[PDB]
């Protein structure tokens, strides 16, 4: 140990700095905030299909089309206003855990226990959906993937790394590192100039896409961080762990703001998302249901109890008009 | 509705009829999960059968389709993806009998067997246990008593008994004694009949699952 004795003192040096920026608290400021009322959402649509458990779901940019992935080896694109099915894409491997819909609407991505990200083309002059590219190089299972534009995508793998790819060639441009535990989730900033990731060592890191460096590390959870999502302004994010608790972090205060826990909740959190204004926080649980939290006061505002098994996916449209939740009973529901 | 919207509905109905055909075809195949230790003999049973993250194998025996999955090449937290395989028909566990002296390795296998057999997800799946290398195992025990591996072994240093003492120390790790049976076979590299044993080990599982689909 030539210098391992000074890393501990360096870590102790940044503790007292994130603790001299804590004059007040979020509660001490939002104490007299108006209550959010009693949120009541009702199921408007139910999408039937996908015989097996549903693992991933993502909304399109036009807030009308969404894609879902299931373990029967199918990708289905739905028209949510009319419950119609637009496409059904058969997968080469049936062990899938991730789907993304591009911002332009021309491609979708997939991945799972085959350590490969597959990209499909939805606008072809032949009537079908074709594989456009397969990206290989991760040595563990693929857990999340998020499009940047038509020609870039960020993936996180169980081999404790994240990568940035070029699709027209099929090679990595940057490789992010530092986690010592499998990465399980990704979230892109609204300007897509940086992103946060959460791993199984109960830590979250922020990285910027250009330089490929790590900026800040956030600690405070007790077990694996399974979901992550960024506030709409882009200066905060929320995490969901297996210790039955969500936390809110500030990128400018560089510390913790608020924790959302109840004494009658014991199961882990599978998904997390914000509403359009950032006032509500949607969280999915193994309790078979989904809580909503007043983000500014950390009080439950309502429940979403309509599923017969574990809630695995959860997302909100870009105009904040509907919430879609997937589950292990092979059903998709749209609320309010 | 307009003609163009009525034609979208017709297309949607056309493609969900194909989703039913594929679902019925996949509910007839039986799927198996191949687990084991490091170089325990998992790379040999597949060649007994007719036959990069995971590898899938396909073979047919007496008008029955089989699908075997291998997850050996995956060093990722098992608790994060092992739930993907719940609902599998059965599990194949390979244990090399000659790993007693080696290094320890047999203890690592007893720990791995104990952990997968007593899982939360696998609470009603049956386990088919293969004890490979029963031939090379003979050349060692006569010059190496089992006490170097099992200290409290109260018995002789002979094949007839040392082979039945590991089978009982593996089948005793079960805790839900009743909902799960364990079928243990003694394989020998040129055994020529493992696939038959798997066949009439999964026939009983099919029968038991038929007694549930009728609620009997």
């Amino acid at each position: 140990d030539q210098l391992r004795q000074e890393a501990e003192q360096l870590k102790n040096q940044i503790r007292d700095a994130r603790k001299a920026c804590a004059d007040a608290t979020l509660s001490q400021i939002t104490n007299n905030i108006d209550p959010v009322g009693r949120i009541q959402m009702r199921t408007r649509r139910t999408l039937r299909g996908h015989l097996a458990k549903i693992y991933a779901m993502h909304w399109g940019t036009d807030s009308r089309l969404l894609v879902s992935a299931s373990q029967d080896g199918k990708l289905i694109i739905w028209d949510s206003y009319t419950t119609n099915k637009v496409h059904a894409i058969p997968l080469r491997s049936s062990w899938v855990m991730t789907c993304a819909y591009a911002p332009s609407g021309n491609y979708v991505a997939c991945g799972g226990l085959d350590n490969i990200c597959s990209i499909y083309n939805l606008k072809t002059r032949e009537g079908n959906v074709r594989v456009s590219r397969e990206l290989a190089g991760h040595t563990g299972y693929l857990s999340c993937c998020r499009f940047l534009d038509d020609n870039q995508i960020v993936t996180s793998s169980g081999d404790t790394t994240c990568a940035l790819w070029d699709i027209e060639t099929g090679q990595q441009t940057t490789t992010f590192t530092g986690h010592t535990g499998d990465v399980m989730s990704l979230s892109l900033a609204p300007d897509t100039r940086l992103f946060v990731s959460g791993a199984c060592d109960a830590s979250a890191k922020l990285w910027d896409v250009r330089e490929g460096m790590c900026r800040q590390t956030f600690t405070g959870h007790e077990s694996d961080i399974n979901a992550i999502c960024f506030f709409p302004n882009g200066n905060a994010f929320a995490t969901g762990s297996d210790d039955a608790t969500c936390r809110l972090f500030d990128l400018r205060a560089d510390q913790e703001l608020m924790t959302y826990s109840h004494d009658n909740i014991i199961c882990g959190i599978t998904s997390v998302s914000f509403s359009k204004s950032g006032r509500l926080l949607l969280a999915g649980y193994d309790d078979f249901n989904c809580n909503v939290w007043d983000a500014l006061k950390a009080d439950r505002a309502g429940v979403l109890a309509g599923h017969d098994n574990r809630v695995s996916c959860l997302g909100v449209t870009d105009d904040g008009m509907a919430v879609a939740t997937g589950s292990w009973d092979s059903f998709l529901k749209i609320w309010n | 509705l307009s003609a163009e919207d009525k034609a979208a509905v017709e297309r949607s109905k056309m493609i969900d009829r194909n989703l039913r055909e594929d679902g019925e075809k996949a509910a007839r195949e039986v799927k198996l999960l191949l687990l084991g230790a490091g170089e325990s003999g998992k790379s040999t049973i597949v060649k007994q059968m007719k036959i990069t993250g995971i590898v899938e194998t396909h073979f047919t025996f007496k008008d029955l389709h089989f699908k075997m999955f291998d997850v050996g090449g995956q060093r990722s937290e098992r608790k994060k993806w092992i739930h993907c395989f719940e609902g599998v028909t059965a599990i194949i566990f390979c244990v090399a009998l000659s790993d007693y002296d080696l290094v320890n390795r047999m203890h690592e296998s007893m720990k791995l067997f104990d952990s997968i057999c007593n899982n939360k997800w696998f609470t009603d799946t049956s386990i088919i246990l293969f004890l490979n290398k029963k031939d090379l195992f003979e050349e060692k025990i006569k010059k190496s008593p089992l006490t170097i591996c099992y200290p409290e072994y109260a018995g002789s240093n002979t094949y007839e008994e040392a082979a039945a003492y590991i089978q009982c120390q593996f089948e005793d790790l079960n805790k839900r004694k009743d909902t799960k049976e364990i079928y243990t076979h003694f394989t020998c590299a040129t055994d020529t009949k493992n696939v038959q044993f798997v066949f009439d080990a999964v026939t009983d599982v099919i029968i038991k699952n038929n007694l549930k689909d009728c609620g009997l």
Epitope: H87 | A3, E10
Partner: single-chain antibody, 231 residues
């Protein structure tokens, strides 16, 4: 993508004939197919339609009974059986493919055409049949319907086609405000209700031809008269 048709020829009145149209280069089984004919020196006229799954068929009132449409998906071929041929069925028949889902563009690829010589419904009032024009200047083309094509789901079902001299029609604008993939950006479409307009800017020596407006609101598809653009 390719469509080749054959079967036409000289015929005596009261006879019979069979036309074929063989696809090549696209997923033929996923497309609905139409037959559209054009009289000698007159305009376009829809004939029949067959469903993707062959579970829906429509006919024009003028060929009902005599004509019957069918498809053979394993061989990728489309047929049209015609009997008791009158002297007013001599035309050039076309093979058109169309696919229907949220965001598609129907009527996008037309066949090459096979000639045949023998021996309540919305009307679409076309503008003046002839507009003189020079390169550079921008012109406008006006169609007018006898019924509002704006449905309650928000879509307006109007289509624009261009037929160059000596070729088959090609799609320009679908659902009145969309640009078909492959055409330049100088074409645009406006209007709403019963009056529509197509405006082209800085025309080159490639927009000469006749322009057709078509409605896809109801069952029997109808076309405009067509307006020529001469240089």
């Amino acid at each position: 993508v390719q469509l080749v048709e054959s079967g036409g020829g000289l015929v005596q009145p009261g006879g019979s004939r069979k036309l074929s149209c063989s696809a090549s280069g696209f997923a033929f089984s996923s497309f609905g197919m139409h037959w559209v004919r054009q009289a000698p020196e007159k305009g376009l006229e829809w004939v029949a339609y067959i469903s993707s799954g062959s579970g829906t068929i429509y006919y024009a009132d003028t060929v009902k009974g005599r004509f019957t449409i069918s498809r053979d998906d394993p061989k990728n071929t489309l047929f049209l059986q015609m009997t008791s041929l009158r002297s007013e069925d001599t035309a050039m028949y076309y093979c058109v493919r169309s696919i229907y889902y949220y965001g598609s563009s129907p009527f996008d690829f037309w066949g090459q055409g096979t000639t045949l010589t023998v021996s309540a419904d919305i009307v679409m009032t076309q503008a003046t049949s002839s507009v003189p024009v020079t390169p550079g200047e921008s012109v406008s083309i006006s169609c007018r319907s006898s019924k509002s094509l704006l449905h309650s789901n928000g879509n307006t079902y109007l289509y624009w086609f261009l037929q160059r001299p000596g070729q088959s029609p090609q799609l320009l604008i679908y659902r009145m405000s969309n640009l078909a993939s492959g055409v330049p950006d100088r074409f645009s479409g406006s209007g709403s209700g019963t009056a529509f307009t197509l405006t082209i800017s800085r025309l080159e020596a490639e927009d000469v031809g006749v322009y057709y407006c078509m409605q896809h609101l109801e069952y029997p598809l109808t076309f405009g008269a067509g307006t020529k653009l001469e240089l």
